[PDB]
């Protein structure tokens, strides 16, 4: 029951129209909404909505987020999707297939704590 602002700020039917449009316009990409888990002691990620190549790996996405938020490299970083932590070698396309919500978006939280 993690809140995401894009969900908090728009009704379902608006989101689903928008996810379906973008999936129609970019069939080899997936739309992903990323937010820091609340009260995780890591920097916030300012840009929250991404259109990502389906073949991009979780680990590649980690590396992009780490750079953007200036995470020190001793610090850990984990994705949460529906309370699970995906394998670093999973693709974002597979993560989307397995977890996208009914508005056709994938919602990803992150923290430097896995537990």
């Amino acid at each position: 029951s993690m809140k995401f602002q894009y969900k908090e700020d728009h009704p379902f039917e608006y989101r689903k129209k928008e996810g379906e449009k973008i999936r129609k316009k970019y069939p080899d990409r997936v739309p992903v909404i990323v937010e820091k888990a609340p009260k995780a002691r890591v920097p916030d990620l300012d840009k929250r909505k991404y259109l990502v190549p389906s073949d991009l790996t979780v680990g590649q996405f980690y590396f992009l987020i780490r750079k953007r938020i200036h995470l020190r490299p001793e610090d850990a970083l984990f994705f949460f999707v529906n309370n699970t932590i995906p394998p670093t070698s999973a693709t974002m396309g597979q993560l989307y297939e397995d977890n996208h919500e009914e508005d056709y978006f994938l919602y990803v939280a992150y923290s430097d704590e896995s537990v």
Binding site: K21, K49, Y50, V52, P53, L64
Partner: peptide, 10 residues
């Protein structure tokens, strides 16, 4: 950045 979604590559 199409429709406020940041387009990533790779």
């Amino acid at each position: 950045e199409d429709e406020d979604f940041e387009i990533l590559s790779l």
